[PDB]
Design a protein around this ligand. Structure first.
Ligand SMILES: O=C1NC(N[C@]23C[C@H]4C[C@H](C[C@H](C4)C2)C3)=N/C1=C\c1ccc2ncsc2c1
Length: 321
C-alpha cells in the first residue's frame, strides 16, 4: 500500500495525488488532480492487493455501475464512480470528490452533536438513499457515519460550521444482492446468527441517528455479549423467541441473558447506558418525534422493524414536507 500512493504520485498517467483523505481496512482514499480533465479534483479509492478486497472491489464496481446507470443524476445520493483502473496490481476506483464523512466532521468538532434541523435533513437523505438500494435488491451491511459523506459545499472550515447538509452514501464492497460489514452498529439478528437482510441496514441507520444527536456512540463496546447487555439496558430485554432460536446459546441461561450485572463490566453497562428515552436533551415535540423514529428503527425483531419506505412517512420529516 504505502509504496504506491504518496503525495506527488501519478496514477494511470493522469491522476496526481495531492492528499490522503482517509485509510481503511480496504486500503486508502486519495484526493487527486485530474490532469486530462481541466484539473478538476477527484477521489481515488486504492484497494489492497488481497484476494478478499479485490473480489469486493470487483463487486463494488458492478454495483456502482448499475446504481449510476439507474440513477444518472444521483437523486438517491449514491456516490458516482467516474472510472476504475489497475495500478501496480491494485484496483483503483475514481469517484466524484466529496467532503468530510459525517464521522470526521463530528470528531474534528470535539464530538459536538449535530443540530436537530440538520439531523432531520441528513436522516431523510440517508433513508431515501438506502431505500433506493433496497429497491434494487441490495443490502449495504456497512452503514456507519464513516460511510455518510457531505458534499464539501455544505459547510465552512476555519471549527467547521455545517451549512446545508446534502449527504452521499459510499462503500458498496460489502453490499449483497438477495440471491445470497459490521462493528458496533451490528443488528441483533446478526449478532445472534439468525440470518439477516435489508432490515439490518434500518437498525444501523438508527444507530447512526442517535450518534448524530449525542455526538458519541451508545454501544461503546468491543465485546458481543456486552453489546447484548447494553441493548437490554437501553432498549429492554431481547425477545424470548430470538433468544431461544440462536445457535449462539453461549450468551444465555434459559430465556434470560447470562450476565452478572455486578461484575466490573456489568457495572460498566449501567454507567455507560440507560433507557433510550432518557437520552433526550429536550422534551420538545421534534425531539419526541426523532426518538420515536429511532425506537422504531431499533426494534429487535427484523419483521416488526419499520422499513425505510414507512420511515420516510414519519412525522419527524413533516417539517421538510
Ligand atoms: O467507497 C468508499 N469507502 C470510503 N471509506 C472511507 C472510510 C474513512 C472515512 C471516509 C474517508 C476515508 C476514511 C475512506 C470514507 N470512502 C469511499 C469513497 C469516497 C468517494 C469520494 C470521496 N470524496 C471525498 S472522501 C471520498 C470517499
Amino acid at each position: 500500500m504505502h509504496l504506491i500512493c504518496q503525495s506527488g504520485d501519478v496514477l494511470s498517467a493522469r491522476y496526481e495525488i495531492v492528499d490522503t483523505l482517509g485509510e481503511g481496512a480496504f486500503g486508502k482514499v486519495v484526493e487527486c488532480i485530474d490532469h486530462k480533465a481541466g484539473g478538476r479534483h477527484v477521489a481515488v479509492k486504492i484497494v489492497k492487493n488481497v484476494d478478499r478486497y479485490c473480489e469486493a472491489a470487483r463487486s463494488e464496481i458492478q454495483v456502482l455501475e448499475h446504481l449510476n446507470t439507474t440513477d444518472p443524476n444521483s437523486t438517491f445520493r449514491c456516490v458516482q464512480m467516474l472510472e476504475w483502473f489497475e495500478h501496480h496490481g491494485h484496483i483503483c476506483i475514481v469517484f466524484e470528490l466529496l467532503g468530510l464523512s459525517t464521522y470526521d466532521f463530528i470528531k474534528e468538532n470535539g464530538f459536538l452533536p449535530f443540530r436537530l434541523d440538520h439531523i432531520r435533513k441528513m436522516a431523510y437523505q440517508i433513508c431515501k438513499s438506502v431505500n433506493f438500494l433496497h429497491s434494487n435488491k441490495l443490502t449495504h451491511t456497512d452503514l456507519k457515519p464513516e460511510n455518510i459523506l457531505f458534499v464539501q459545499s455544505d459547510y465552512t472550515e476555519a471549527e467547521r460550521t455545517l451549512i446545508n447538509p446534502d449527504i452521499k452514501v459510499v462503500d458498496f464492497g460489502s453490499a449483497t444482492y438477495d440471491d445470497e460489514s459490521t462493528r458496533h452498529y451490528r443488528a441483533p439478528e446478526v449478532i445472534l446468527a439468525l440470518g439477516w437482510s435489508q432490515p439490518c441496514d434500518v437498525w444501523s441507520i438508527g444507530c447512526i441517528l442517535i450518534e448524530y444527536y449525542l455526538g458519541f456512540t451508545v454501544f461503546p463496546t468491543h465485546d458481543s455479549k456486552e453489546h447484548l447487555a447494553m441493548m437490554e439496558r437501553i432498549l429492554g430485554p431481547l425477545p424470548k423467541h430470538m433468544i431461544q432460536k440462536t445457535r449462539k446459546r453461549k450468551y444465555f441461561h434459559h430465556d434470560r441473558l447470562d450476565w452478572d450485572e455486578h461484575s466490573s463490566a456489568g457495572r460498566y453497562v449501567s454507567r455507560a447506558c440507560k433507557p433510550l428515552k432518557e437520552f433526550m436533551l429536550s422534551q420538545d415535540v421534534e425531539h419526541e418525534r426523532l426518538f420515536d423514529l429511532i425506537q422504531k428503527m431499533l426494534e429487535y425483531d427484523p419483521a416488526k422493524r419499520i422499513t425505510l419506505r414507512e420511515a420516510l412517512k414519519h412525522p419527524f420529516f413533516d417539517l421538510l414536507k
